[PDB]
Amino acid sequence: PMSQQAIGSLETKGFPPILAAADAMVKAGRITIVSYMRAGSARFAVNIRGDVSEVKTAMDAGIEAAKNTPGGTLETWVIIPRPHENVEAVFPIGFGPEVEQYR
Amino acid sequence: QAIGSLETKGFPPILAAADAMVKAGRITIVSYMRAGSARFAVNIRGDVSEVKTAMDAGIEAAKNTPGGTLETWVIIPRPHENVEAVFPIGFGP
Amino acid sequence: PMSQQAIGSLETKGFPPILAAADAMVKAGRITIVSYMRAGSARFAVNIRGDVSEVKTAMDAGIEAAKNTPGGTLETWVIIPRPHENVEAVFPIGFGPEVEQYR
Amino acid sequence: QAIGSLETKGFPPILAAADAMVKAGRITIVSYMRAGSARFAVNIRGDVSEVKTAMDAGIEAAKNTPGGTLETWVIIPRPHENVEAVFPIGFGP
Amino acid sequence: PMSQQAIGSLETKGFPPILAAADAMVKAGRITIVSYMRAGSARFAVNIRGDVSEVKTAMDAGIEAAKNTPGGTLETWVIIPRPHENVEAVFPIGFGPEVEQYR
Amino acid sequence: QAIGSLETKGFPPILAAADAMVKAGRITIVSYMRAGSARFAVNIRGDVSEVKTAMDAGIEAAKNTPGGTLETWVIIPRPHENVEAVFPIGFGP
């Protein structure tokens, strides 16, 4: 009941910084971007999956890209190495059929 | 079964809380609520003693998350059945 | 054109305090919880129906439960003894088929 | 028919306003708007003299509600028909 | 690829001031109200179309009506004389079938 | 193709930005995002040199709009294809 793949989630204020973060993340490690969350208050979170070491290196790049985007604000981030299956069942952080082609 | 509900500012800390809760007691995460203003609540069910231990872990995980903040939480030991008929805190699919 | 049953509505900041309020309300009087409103800004309202004397005693318990929830904030409440039918027609405060079994 | 629209912060005060309005004049409540930021607007229609009396009662009910606040209101006597084609202030189902 | 008709868009805080603006606009010039946008934070925008000279006179009336509504706030407005077709394709500012009868 | 994204407070300034961008370079406006808190983002695609010229025009149009404010913007020259599989920045219908 715990997934093999880590989750990393990063949240910005602003849509352009989340795109910056997402692109930097997938260019920095063997990770898949699985989903995004429109959180309200102009905040957005991006969710990535991969082995924890790869998610950590991806997260470092996403953090920098968010902060370096003009007018962007990094709000919060987390890495969970081996998330319980019930988390994946309830939250939109699983692998959907549109990202299979990239994994 | 008891209900525990915990609410954070930010999506990453609600994930952290949820994962910590289900790894700390015999509970089921049944739903989450997008509250607006970048707040999210996670709802768990279990025997009250298990919900309590889970809640303690979830509070700590939310506060320990980079940039995460804990807003509010509750434990209701034996909720009236009318509550889960109206609020999305039941077990069913 | 005025209902036999009062409406009570109570609004909190935070989802956990609204659950606290709702549970305290239905445990304190002969009332039915009919609906909730996601108001934005992390505010939620719960709507109950019953005879006005029962809604008043329920409301007192809901107010206390909201205020006593960790991090919860009570925002606003009302009791309308005999609401006009047009209010029930437009606002989601009627009795739905999922709560018949509890009334 | 005239349109009256009244907006509160909070859901309980919009209920109070709506009920007071329909009990104060020959008007029909046609819709409500969830505006965001916990604001709600109620929309009524009737002859303008009736909408005026109703509006006065609704303003007082909103302000009199525990924790309720009145944000903004308007009365438009004879709205152009293009307005109700776009905004949800018409009578129809 | 640029429309013959200008767009004017006006945004208020509050729903009653947007109704005031919309009504004043269509009473002040040969314009069609095409749509409204629920922007969040209790802000609303109304979108009108017409020849630019007509949209300008309509906009002046909408600005005044918004400001003069009890508790209303004017937030922002624009007039674009000859919008590119790609703007109409992506943003909800075109003529829909419900407003044909008024144009 | 590159992605440019520009976000304003207010709906009128996003229209201004979008129109200025497509009139300043060989770009396609592919989508907009209602972000909440009355913020909106417009997303454009094109060769990066064209997206840059378009972005400059969009920044100026947003700031020049009465009451409009520019919040944030970005240009990504060569986005990874996983980004447009998840975010609504692709070309398709």
User: Do residues F58 and F18 touch, judged by C-beta distance below 8 A?
Assistant: yes
The Cα–Cα gap between C29 and C58 comes to 5
Of B33, B70, B83, the CB nearest to C15: B33
| Tokens found for residue F81 | 């294809």
The Cα–Cα gap between C5 and C72 comes to 29
Question: What single-letter DSSP state applies at residue A48?
Answer: E
CA dihedral sign of residues C86, C87, C93, C99? negative
DSSP B3-67: EEEEEEESHHHHHHHHHHHHTTSSEEEEEEEEEETTEEEEEEEE-HHHHHHHHHHHHHHHHHSTT
Stated as kind and residue range, the H or E segment containing E23 is: helix E15-26
Task: List chains touching A (3+ CB pairs under 8 A).
Answer: B, F
Stated as kind and residue range, the H or E segment containing F84 is: helix F81-86
The Cα–Cα gap between D14 and D11 comes to 5
Elucidated via: X-ray
* DSSP-based three-state secondary structure for F59: helix
Query: Which residue, among A74, A64, A53, A73, has the nearest Cα to A8 in the 3D structure?
Result: A53
* Nearest chain E alpha carbon to D44: E16
Residue numbers in C near D50 (CB within 8 A): none
How far out from the chain centre does Cα F81 lie? 18
Q: Which residues neighbour E100 within 8 Å (Cβ) at sequence distance 6 or greater?
A: none
| Tokens found for residue A57 | 């290196």
Instruction: Please check whether residue A63 touches B, CB under 8 A.
Output: no
DSSP D7-56: EEESHHHHHHHHHHHHTTSSEEEEEEEEEETTEEEEEEEE-HHHHHHHHH
| Angle value at C-alpha A63, between A62 and A67, nearest 5 degrees | 115
Beta strands, E only, C18-99: 32-40, 43-50, 73-80
Environment class of residue E81 by beta-carbon count within 10 Å: exposed (0-12), middle (13-18) or buried (19+)? middle
Residue of B5, B9, B19 to mutate when probing chain A, most A C-beta within 10 A: B19
CATH topology of domain D1-93: Alpha-Beta Plaits (3.30.70)
Question: What single-letter DSSP state applies at residue C2?
Answer: B
Residue that is written with structure tokens 């309020």 in the block: C21
The Cα–Cα gap between D77 and D4 comes to 8
Residue of F8, F11, F65 to mutate when probing chain E, most E C-beta within 10 A: F11
Residue of E60, E86, E88 to mutate when probing chain F, most F C-beta within 10 A: E86
Stated as kind and residue range, the H or E segment containing F40 is: strand F39-46
A76 φ, ψ (degrees, to nearest 5): -165, 155
Instruction: Please check whether residue F4 touches E, CB under 8 A.
Output: no
Closest-CA distance of chain C to residue B51, Å: 14
Instruction: Please check whether residue E68 touches D, CB under 8 A.
Output: no
The Cα–Cα gap between C79 and C21 comes to 15
The Cα–Cα gap between B4 and A91 comes to 17
The Cα–Cα gap between F85 and D93 comes to 39
CB–CB contact B39 C36 (8 Å)? no
User: Do residues F33 and F1 touch, judged by C-beta distance below 8 A?
Assistant: no
Query: Which residue, among F50, F51, F45, F37, has the nearest Cα to F8 in the 3D structure?
Result: F37
Closest-CA distance of chain B to residue A46, Å: 9
Question: What single-letter DSSP state applies at residue E57?
Answer: H
Domain ranges of chain F: 1-93
User: Do residues D19 and D27 touch, judged by C-beta distance below 8 A?
Assistant: no
* Nearest chain B alpha carbon to A36: B11
Environment class of residue E57 by beta-carbon count within 10 Å: exposed (0-12), middle (13-18) or buried (19+)? middle
User: Do residues A71 and A14 touch, judged by C-beta distance below 8 A?
Assistant: yes
Q: Which CATH class is domain E1-103?
A: alpha beta
